[PDB]
């Protein structure tokens, strides 16, 4: 009932421009000190900008001149305008709420991943990893989905639209020699009920706004 959810991330060419949005529920952006903070390997977590309730904005030195934080109170959404993106701007971007204006970051969003590169987006192919006598052990059966050949990151995968989370393992993606990513997601379930339950992996690759629902059938 009280959360933050970011959107807008994806592939952007150097010098390009992107707009991130962040929709709040359970509180009003117009009466809160909202911040953007990013994270990437090397520099770790990095504060980027803030907008006060009254409206003052402040920016980190590394994005002064290029980024602009804003909010529309009608939609209760918060925005980060990103111009003239550079290689080093690749990061997960989080919006975060603070109190007291002294910066605590008490509530964060899920994050949205921005990849600055000159390559091209490619959506994945999804193939079932079907349960069979070679993926059963002691009454348990393994099954999964293989999410092959996409760029850039990330791919997210749900099972049964979010209703199946026990026993799921979505593996970190690997970089294939083609420069494309591949990942697998698997689940273990009872063997005895493979004939009566249905298992569907939901694959979302928002950088190429691609969505695939793949029923995984026993072999």
């Amino acid at each position: 009932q009280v959360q933050l959810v970011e959107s807008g991330g994806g592939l952007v060419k150097p010098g390009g421009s992107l707009r991130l949005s962040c929709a709040a529920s359970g509180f009003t952006v117009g009466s809160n000190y909202m911040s953007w903070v990013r994270q990437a390997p090397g520099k770790g977590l990095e504060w980027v900008s803030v907008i006060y309730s009254g409206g003052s904005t402040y920016y980190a030195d590394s994005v002064k001149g290029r980024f602009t934080i804003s909010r529309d109170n009608s939609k209760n959404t918060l925005y980060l305008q990103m111009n003239s993106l550079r290689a080093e701007d690749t990061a997960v971007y989080y919006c975060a709420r603070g109190s007291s204006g002294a910066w605590y970051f008490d509530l964060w969003g899920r994050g949205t991943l921005v990849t600055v590169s000159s390559a091209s987006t490619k959506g994945p192919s999804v193939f079932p990893l079907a349960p069979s006598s070679k993926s059963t052990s002691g009454g348990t059966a393994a099954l999964g989905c293989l999410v092959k050949d996409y760029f850039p990151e990330p791919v997210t995968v749900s099972w049964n639209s979010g209703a199946l989370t026990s026993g799921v393992h979505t593996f970190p993606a690997v970089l294939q020699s083609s420069g494309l990513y591949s990942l697998s997601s698997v689940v273990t379930v009872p063997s005895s009920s493979l004939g009566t339950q249905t298992y569907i992996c939901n694959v979302n690759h928002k950088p190429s706004n691609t969505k695939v629902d793949k029923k995984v059938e026993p072999a």
Partner: protein
């Protein structure tokens, strides 16, 4: 700008141990110091604010101390779910800055992997590529070795592997390996096998199939 340091970079401990991690500011920051917990793929979560105040709903086994330039966070009965990277953060001078983080892992009993193998899907085969996948499930410690064998001949250079983060419930890991061949190459051999070595097994395990 204030530089925030943290030690150790990581540590391992068992369930019930008490663990203390440290954070140093380059100069005095009073008690303007916050602690965050983050697990891989998830957003940070505020644990302690103003050096020693528990955020609402944090278990009492977390506590923080310090003032000036040295600060500590202490967990008294380490639980499997406390697996994470912990970040400290100052707000005394602009701009606020974060430490590089300390990773807390957990030890547990040796557990041998369960091993499964998946032949390529026909959907993929008709596109001319054959991926064969080997799954190692729920093992500990994380060190494990997979070898691919086609018609009993060891392979190199055509596989890739990836290990999960540590499970927040049972403190195990899982591992996925994929062997990728062309449809032409795939259809010229009979038996496909992944061979698994791990400290929980006295002899390497092999899962295979024909076709």
């Amino acid at each position: 700008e204030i530089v925030m340091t943290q030690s150790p970079s990581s540590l391992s401990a068992s369930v019930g141990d008490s663990v203390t991690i440290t954070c140093q500011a380059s100069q005095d920051i009073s008690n303007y110091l916050n602690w965050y917990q983050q697990k891989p793929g998830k957003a940070p979560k505020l644990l302690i604010y103003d050096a020693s105040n528990l955020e609402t709903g944090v278990p009492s086994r977390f506590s923080g101390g310090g003032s000036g330039t040295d600060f500590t966070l202490t967990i008294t009965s380490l639980q499997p779910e406390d697996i994470a990277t912990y970040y400290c953060q100052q707000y005394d001078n602009f701009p606020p800055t974060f430490g590089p983080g300390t990773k807390v892992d957990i030890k547990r009993t040796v557990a041998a992997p369960s091993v499964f193998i998946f032949p390529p899907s026909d959907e993929q085969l008709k596109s001319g590529t054959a991926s064969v996948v080997c799954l190692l499930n729920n093992f500990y410690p994380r060190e494990a070795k997979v070898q691919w064998k086609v018609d009993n001949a060891l392979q190199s250079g055509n596989s890739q592997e990836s290990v999960t983060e540590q499970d927040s419930a049972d403190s195990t890991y899982s591992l996925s390996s994929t062997l990728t061949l062309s449809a032409a190459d795939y259809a010229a051999h009979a038996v496909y096998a992944c061979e698994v070595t791990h400290q929980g097994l006295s002899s390497p395990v092999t899962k295979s199939f024909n076709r």
